């Protein structure tokens, strides 16, 4: 029943973290990005254009794939897990603001599914 | 004469189920509510409206007798979408993937 011996490779070494961030950019985000439903998520919600003047009152931490893409491309993240949280915030925001059953919610759910499918294959 | 039950059971439990549960199913799971979507003219341009909600209820209530009827209702749904919507529209892309899948599934239909 003897447990696994202790760690001998250190997860904080730089490439281990960069490899994960790279997978999040090149595999995960990219896959979501090329999906037919990406387009309402490719930029911050434009409250004025869509005329939703409560959005920024209701949603306190906005997030979108365009911003995540920028962070991944510009040294924002310490690690993949921070990035994963931004995705989660993006989906959660959509589910909070919109009515279950709205087109946009159904589109976020399809994205989230694909997201979770790819996250499962993150290298370690 | 003979109700084509074997073919129609296949349609309900294999074909319908698969498209019903597909990620792109939802716009097609009930008739087009033209009020809610403010498509005032929908019911003037689509003269034979058809959707999977209606196909499903029909298969479940033994509405159909011929397999070809049910298969043609699916074809009408897909065509209704292509005639009312511009090519490239999100809904047209969805209908296209659902159709390709349906075509795929229909190929293994049991025989009368």
């Amino acid at each position: 029943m003897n447990p696994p011996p202790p760690e001998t490779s250190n997860p904080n070494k730089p490439k281990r973290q960069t490899n994960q961030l790279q997978y999040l950019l090149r595999v995960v985000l990219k896959t979501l990005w090329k999906h037919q439903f990406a387009w309402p998520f490719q930029q911050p919600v434009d409250a004025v254009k869509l005329n939703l003047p409560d959005y920024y009152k209701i949603i306190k931490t906005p997030m979108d794939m365009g911003t995540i893409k920028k962070r991944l491309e510009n040294n924002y993240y310490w690690n993949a897990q921070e990035c994963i949280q931004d995705f989660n915030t993006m989906f959660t925001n959509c589910y909070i603001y919109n009515k279950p059953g709205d087109d946009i919610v159904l589109m976020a759910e399809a994205l989230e599914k694909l997201f979770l499918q790819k996250i499962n294959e993150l290298p370690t | 004469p003979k109700r084509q039950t074997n073919q129609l059971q296949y349609l309900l439990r294999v074909v319908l189920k698969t498209l019903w549960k597909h990620q792109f199913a939802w716009p097609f799971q009930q008739p087009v509510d033209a009020v809610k979507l403010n498509l005032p003219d929908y019911y003037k341009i689509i003269k034979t409206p058809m959707d999977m909600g209606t196909i499903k209820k029909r298969l479940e209530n033994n509405y159909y007798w011929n397999a070809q009827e049910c298969i043609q209702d699916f074809n009408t749904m897909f065509t209704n979408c292509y005639i009312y919507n511009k090519p490239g529209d999100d809904i047209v892309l969805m209908a296209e993937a659902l159709e390709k899948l349906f075509l795929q599934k229909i190929n293994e239909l049991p025989t009368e």
Binding site: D102 | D90, I91
Partner: peptide
């Protein structure tokens, strides 16, 4: 807000 119908 949506598929654009």
């Amino acid at each position: 807000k949506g598929l654009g119908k």
